[model samples]
Target: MAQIIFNEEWMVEKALMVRTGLGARQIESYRQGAWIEGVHFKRVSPSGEKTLRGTTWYNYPEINKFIRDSLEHHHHHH
Candidate 1:
């Protein structure tokens, strides 16, 4: 049998970085101005109200399509 492994319980920045090829620093940079929080992004824990700063959380489906839309928004410069 083939090895199978996965979960959407969620994955953090490093796994996301691996998935998208976007650097950890730059990805957060994407968050700072372009992206929105409480959607593709989240800071505080669900039960607590506090920002983890550089340790904020994000998931694949939300993140991938966030980039996905941006790619569409980015038009060819001629």
Candidate 2:
């Protein structure tokens, strides 16, 4: 099969603003210990590297779920 379109994908700088309105760094802060690789986001490197200093692709729906969970946890019902 051939490659196709992405359900939705974006770099932290662009993706974070759309929903959380958080800065790119703030989203990265979430990534440090709270998030998952190849799940919430993916490391993309031209020279085959994996580091925040390089390109990182965010998965739209997974991140959407992440923020939703955060919002739900932000306030407790009981």
Candidate 3:
């Protein structure tokens, strides 16, 4: 198994922004290898209702692969 030396500082931020996309400064942090994990997020709006928004993300390449293989990747339990 490969050990990923994730930068502690960046890793924390990456975990937070997993759902909410980062700002310009945050983007910079990621580019510098400051805990940057690739994830996806989106928002939804309903008629005559307030905007609904949310985000989802993941790390650990192997874990990601497992989800991808089974097509059952979810972010509720973890």
lDDT by candidate, in order shown: 0.70, 0.69, 0.42
- Return the number of clashes found in candidate 2: 0
Clashing pairs in 2: none
lDDT of 3 at 48: 46
1-78 in candidate 2: lDDT tens per residue? 688866765666575566556676777688786668877777777676555566777776776777787677765665
Error of 3 at 48 (Å): 45
TM-score of each: 0.56, 0.57, 0.19
List all candidate RMSDs to the true structure.
6.2, 4.7, 15.1
Q: Which regions in candidate 2 have their CA more than 4 angstroms from the true location? A: 1-6, 47-54, 73-78
Count the clashes in each prediction.
0, 0, 0
Candidate 2 local lDDT, residue 57: 73
> Between which residue pairs do clashes occur in model 1?
none
The candidate that wins on TM-score is 2
Q: Residue 66, candidate 1: how far off, in angstroms?
A: 2.0
lDDT of 3 by residue, 12-73 (tens): 33564453344557545544653333432223334446644422233445333433644764
Per-residue lDDT over 13-42 for candidate 1, one digit per residue giving the tens place of the 0 to 100 score: 787788778897888788787657776766
Better of 2 and 3 by TM-score: 2
